[PDB]
Design a protein around this ligand. Structure first.
Ligand SMILES: CC(C)Oc1ccc(Cl)c2cc(C(=N)N)sc12
Ligand SMILES: CC(C)Oc1ccc(Cl)c2cc(C(=N)N)sc12
Ligand SMILES: CC(C)Oc1ccc(Cl)c2cc(C(=N)N)sc12
Ligand SMILES: CC(C)Oc1ccc(Cl)c2cc(C(=N)N)sc12
Ligand SMILES: [Mg+2]
Ligand SMILES: [Mg+2]
Ligand SMILES: [Mg+2]
Ligand SMILES: [Mg+2]
Lengths: 5, 236, 236, 5
């Protein structure tokens, strides 16, 4: 999965 | 409101203790209680709210993905029928996740967003609104999916518009908003080109503004810039 | 009984799914429902019950230790008074932990232990009884502490007596019981010499019985033997 | 903390 904040 | 009898300051203090103890469900309940006191939230308080709910929903999303993967394998050709249980339990986790998202969206609509006038509060809350509609979209199907997707897009877009007018390109809220909206484009809206373009433009405009920053601000901004680069590497 | 309407087999299946999804509270609720069906538990089912509750209470214990450390620092000379909040929140976590232990002990007393006649079930449940009284003892104070401590000791001792008569010294249930009873002696009963003696004797008697084991059983037993050695290294 | 299982 891609990075999110 | 189960927290109605506790002082606002005590709720905030207990949210910080719950964070240290990695008790994120408690942390989220304390922050929900704090929001329901009706006063605006400071920057630190906004981040306590977001950390708490992000950890709660993050665990739910991770569990949902495990169960959905098991469910899909049980529905492929050649697999043995194991009954309704995998679907039922995936649905239970999904309903609990949707309930958390509904709770957060309810706090934003009553009444955090409408009282948020400074960019750093309003952008933060609109980013949250986009994020929690995005989590709903991850589990939605069909036409409900379309309206949920558009609500996420609309919230992210309003946040983007404000952030571009009112924040420098290195502002960590602006950067994290762009990171997440880029992921929305890639994973939710089936718009990988838009996702890549947004991540690249965000990264490059932040790069050019780093010279204005102190050492501590530089650290905060470059951390999120590295996540933009990480995603670009995953996608190209 | 919230699980009263779900089939026993479905509860077991969902407990296994919850384990894969790292949803240990759900896993424990499913297994509690399975126990409350009234039938004895198989070996696999006993381990699903224990894994579920061990993870739940383990998180509670970790949180309690964080909060208790903060509470003690706030009560030392020179520290600033920050009000009742740390104590209150430590007490909340403590009460939830005690409730989990009371629930497990209630399942053992109604009616798992009294129907458990084979050593591998009876020892397992008596070990659990000692473990959950031990977790109560970790948070107990004063005279209540003494009676809780003696209940833990009594359960561990009955389990030890059966295990020595009915199981080989490498049996993983027997080994784990001895490991945990040794920790009880060190951390709860203020008996470090008894703890060290038990760990050493257990390790040495298991060593001498490894020759009887298949490769898979050897792996299971030596894993727990290494924990006995780890503790001995921590204590000597 | 010491090891338990
Ligand atoms: C205004 C300052 C003191 O507070 C913050 C700013 C930015 C972030 Cl990201 C953050 C996260 C926090 C947390 N996890 N407790 S406090 C906090
Ligand atoms: C029917 C679709 C389009 O909308 C939803 C689905 C699921 C949930 Cl949980 C939810 C919460 C919402 C809110 N608090 N605004 S809208 C919404
Ligand atoms: C009888 C066999 C098939 O089942 C077991 C034996 C021993 C242990 Cl330790 C264990 C742990 C399990 C789990 N975490 N699901 S199943 C299981
Ligand atoms: C008063 C002391 C000696 O005993 C206890 C304290 C706290 C709890 Cl949670 C508890 C649960 C118990 C059970 N289910 N048998 S005894 C017990
Ligand atoms: Mg007040
Ligand atoms: Mg553009
Ligand atoms: Mg039946
Ligand atoms: Mg002896």
């Amino acid at each position: 999965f891609p990075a999110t904040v | 409101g189960a927290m109605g009898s506790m002082e606002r300051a005590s709720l905030i203090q207990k949210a910080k203790l719950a964070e240290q103890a990695e008790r994120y469900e408690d942390m989220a309940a304390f922050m929900k209680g704090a929001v329901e006191k009706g006063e605006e939230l400071s920057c630190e308080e906004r981040n306590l709210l977001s950390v708490a709910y992000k950890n709660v929903v993050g665990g739910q999303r991770a569990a949902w993905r495990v169960l959905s993967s098991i469910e899909q394998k049980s529905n492929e050709e050649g697999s043995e029928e194991k009954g309704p249980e995998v679907r039922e339990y995936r649905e239970k986790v999904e309903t609990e996740l949707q309930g958390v998202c509904d709770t957060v969206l309810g706090l934003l609509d009553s009444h955090l967003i409408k009282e948020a006038g400074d960019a750093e509060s309003r952008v933060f809350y609109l980013k949250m609104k986009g994020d929690y509609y995005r989590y709903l979209a991850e589990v939605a199907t069909g036409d409900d999916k379309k309206r949920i997707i558009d609500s996420a897009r609309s919230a992210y877009q309003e946040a983007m518009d404000i952030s571009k007018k009112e924040m420098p390109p290195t502002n960590p809220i602006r950067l994290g908003l762009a990171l997440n909206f880029s992921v929305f484009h890639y994973e939710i809206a089936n718009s990988p080109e838009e996702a890549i373009s947004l991540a690249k433009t965000t990264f490059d405009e932040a790069m050019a503004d780093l010279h204005t920053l102190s050492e501590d601000s530089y650290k905060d901004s470059t951390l999120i810039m590295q996540l933009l680069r990480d995603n670009l590497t995953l996608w190209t």
